[PDB]
Structures are given as C-alpha cells and as structure tokens.
C-alpha cells in the first residue's frame, strides 16, 4: 500500500489541518471584528476578541521593539525543522508521539506565517473571570501547540 512508502510523513496532514483551521479562524475574526472589540459568549467567562500580538511579554529583553517578529519566527523555523525530522524517525504504533508532534508543528507554522506575512500574531480567544483577571488572548495555533506540548510532557509518564 501507500502507507508504507511515505513512512510517518502523512501525519503532516494533521499539521496542515491545524494550520488551515488556524488561518480560517484568524481570517474570520480579522473580518468580523475591530481591534480589542469583544463578542460576548459567556458574559462572566468567555468572549471572542481581536488582538495583535507583537510579543510585549518579552519586551524586557531589549530597548528596541519589533525584533520579536524575527527572533520568534527564527525560533519557529528552527524548531519546526527539528520537529519534522523527529517525526520521520518515528515508528508505526507510536501514534501518540506522531499526533503530538503534528499538533505542535501546525501551531508553530500557523503563528510563523503570521509573524512573516503580518507583523504579528492574530489572537481571538478571550477567557476571563468577570473583571477580576483576564487570560492573555490566544488562538487555535496556541491550542494545538499547548495540547501537543502537554501530550509530549505526559509521555515521560
């Protein structure tokens, strides 16, 4: 069959699927919302939003702004490469690792595309508790990465 000639490569269809859903997601909320506008789903807990993440969380590392676009893109590129080879070196029946890797790769490329094409990453998911605390807005790419990362972390049993 064809499953045997491409090895572990067809797991990248999960990566593509993640990438696409991530980009359709962002495109929608770029179209439907203005910056920081929020569509309330659960008044106290959860809302859609629109935010551009130029990465101000790591602003403490430099007297310049705008470098996160390139540094983080660079890290994405580097980590993506190493993640692909490590997907290839896998065996059939290691289905847990393949999925986890594909998820992280999809999220990595999703935000990588943003930092390169746009100047920033698009964020639309706003989870919070009333006006007591707000969780930093994220997207599907982050979710794929986070779920992917946790799956890897629970692999060390």
């Amino acid at each position: 069959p064809d499953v045997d000639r491409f090895g572990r490569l067809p797991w990248l269809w999960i990566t593509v699927l993640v990438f696409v859903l991530d980009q359709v997601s962002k495109a929608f909320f770029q179209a439907e919302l203005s910056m920081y506008q929020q569509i309330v789903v659960i008044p106290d807990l959860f809302s859609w939003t629109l935010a551009y993440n130029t990465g101000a969380a790591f602003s403490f590392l430099a007297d310049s702004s705008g470098w996160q676009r390139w540094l983080f893109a660079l890290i994405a590129i580097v980590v993506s490469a190493s993640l692909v080879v490590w997907l290839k070196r896998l065996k059939k029946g290691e289905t847990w690792l393949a999925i986890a890797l594909a998820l992280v790769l999809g999220g990595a490329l999703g935000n990588l595309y943003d930092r390169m094409v746009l100047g920033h990453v698009v964020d639309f998911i706003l989870v919070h508790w009333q006006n007591r605390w707000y969780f930093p807005a994220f997207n599907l790419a982050d979710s794929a990465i986070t779920v992917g990362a946790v799956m890897l972390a629970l692999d060390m049993f």
């Binding site: 990465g55 969380a57 790591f58 999220g107 930093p136 807005a137 994220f138 997207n139 990465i145």
Partner: peptide, 4 residues
C-alpha cells in the same frame, strides 16, 4: 512558537 506561541502568540506571546
């Protein structure tokens, strides 16, 4: 990799 993530947004932030």
């Amino acid at each position: 990799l993530i947004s932030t």
